[PDB]
């Protein structure tokens, strides 16, 4: 009985549970493409993260060796 959980789990009802099936067939698709496009952005954002741990590792080697 939390206010946001009753309201968060209500975006499904208002966007899916109200109309056609030959529209559900063409809506269930683009909901997955919205994830594949979102699961790729999450990959190229972890690879970049790995690379910054190296830059900062290199930079932290230069501020301590040049003092």
């Amino acid at each position: 009985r939390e206010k946001k959980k009753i309201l968060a789990e209500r975006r499904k009802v208002l966007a899916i549970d109200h109309l056609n099936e030959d529209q559900l067939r063409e809506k269930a698709k683009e909901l997955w493409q919205s994830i594949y496009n979102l699961e790729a952005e999450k990959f190229d954002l972890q690879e970049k993260f790995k690379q910054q741990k190296y830059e900062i590792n290199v930079l932290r080697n230069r501020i301590n060796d040049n003092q």
Binding site: Y54, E55, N57, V58, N61, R62, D65, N66
Partner: protein
């Protein structure tokens, strides 16, 4: 950026060291020590679309006066004629990781030596020796990121 000028001085065709030698005897038509000074460099500069100041004239000579005479002779002239005939820092950092295989932030002798072997060319023993000490400007065993730049200036 010094030992890259000699590279294009050694590779000067003898059909090009003849023009420069000819155009250098005309340069000095009136100097005692037979060498280019500020009097002569004054001529072919303001008689060529400038008017550089006498000190500004002497600093085009000190950059290639490896003799301390202020008299750019012939061997100092070819160095000058190749300072007027590269690779970016934003790019020499994504190459600096393909050396640092153990990902420590440095390039020790065994990281450069495995890179030398993959070049398809034949490495000797002295090639690896002179290269490391060309980069390691403090003899700490590694070429850090600040030296890997002063190392690879002007490399195509």
């Amino acid at each position: 950026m010094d030992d890259i000028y000699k590279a294009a001085v050694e590779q000067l065709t003898e059909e090009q060291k003849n023009e420069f030698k000819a155009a250098f005897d005309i340069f000095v038509l009136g100097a005692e020590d037979g060498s280019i000074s500020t009097k002569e460099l004054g001529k072919v500069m303001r008689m060529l679309g400038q008017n550089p100041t006498p000190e500004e004239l002497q600093e085009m000579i000190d950059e290639v006066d490896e003799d301390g005479s202020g008299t750019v002779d012939f061997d100092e002239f070819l160095v000058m004629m190749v300072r007027s005939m590269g690779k970016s820092e934003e790019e020499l950092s994504d190459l600096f990781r393909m050396f640092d295989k153990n990902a420590d932030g440095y390039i020790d002798l065994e990281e450069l030596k495995i890179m030398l072997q993959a070049t398809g060319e034949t490495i000797t023993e002295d090639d690896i020796e002179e290269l490391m000490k060309d980069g390691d400007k403090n003899n700490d065993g590694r070429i850090d990121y600040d030296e890997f730049l002063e190392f690879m200036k002007g490399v195509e």
